[PDB]
């Protein structure tokens, strides 16, 4: 409760997204600092549960993770206040015309930035569980930060979820690596959806047969190798994020 602040020192301006659990707004703190405000629509979700995301964020702080600044909990609609990212999700950015212009070099940069943030998560013995392009935000400076920690721990995105997780509820840091490989596919394709023209049900079935997404026309052999490292059936045999950052950094040069 040192993160509590008066509702008066927050003005909402533009709505960014609208979910069933509420909305997200760009706003200002004390008229000076622009911020993002996550709104809890009461009824759809319990207060205590909605806040556990923020509670988790007090613990986790890193430059590749979206920083919590404050919260508003005393009155009817509840706010969570974070740093604002000018370009929205990595998915919004890549799909936008500006992101279309961006070419492989920077895509690798984005890749590595994310691996770095995740290397922090593994260092700190956590798991994200919902790691994908929609939950990575982008600043005006073109920096990437991991945003939504709703499912993070000390509904699940089926097409980003590892086979052992789906089959045995076994979510671990290695499951997040799987997801990262899938994130790579999102990046290299400029925001396209994984397993194109397939249902979640299809994918679950296909993964039991040992399916893996074949290489994309763009994706270089040596990057595809990195993706394929992440997608090894046995979780133990997948790399660490530390290692992924390295190889992604050295690919650059
Ligand atoms: C735990 C983190 C909570 C959170 C949640 C957000 O909501 C977004 C989630 C991903 N989908 C869209 C909403 C945030 N959005 C932004 N900026 C933002 C968002 C969307 C757009 C579109 N054009 N420009 C944009 C700028 N900045 C910080 C955010 C923080």
Curated annotation (Swiss-Prot):
Q: Where does ATP bind?
A: 16-24, 38
Q: Where in the cell is it found?
A: Cell membrane; Nucleus; Cytoplasm; Cytoplasm, Perinuclear region
Q: Which residues form the Protein kinase domain?
A: 10-252
Tissue expression remark: Detected in monocytes (at protein level). Detected in placenta, and in fetal brain, lung, liver and kidney. Widely expressed in a variety of organs, tissues, and cell types such as epidermoid, hematopoietic, and neuronal cells. Expressed in primary neuroblastoma tumors.
Q: Where is the active site?
A: 130
For domains, the record's comment is: The protein kinase domain plays an important role in its localization in the cell membrane.
- What protein name does the entry list? Tyrosine-protein kinase Lyn
Organism from which the protein derives? Homo sapiens (Human)
As recorded in Swiss-Prot or TrEMBL, the protein's gene is named LYN
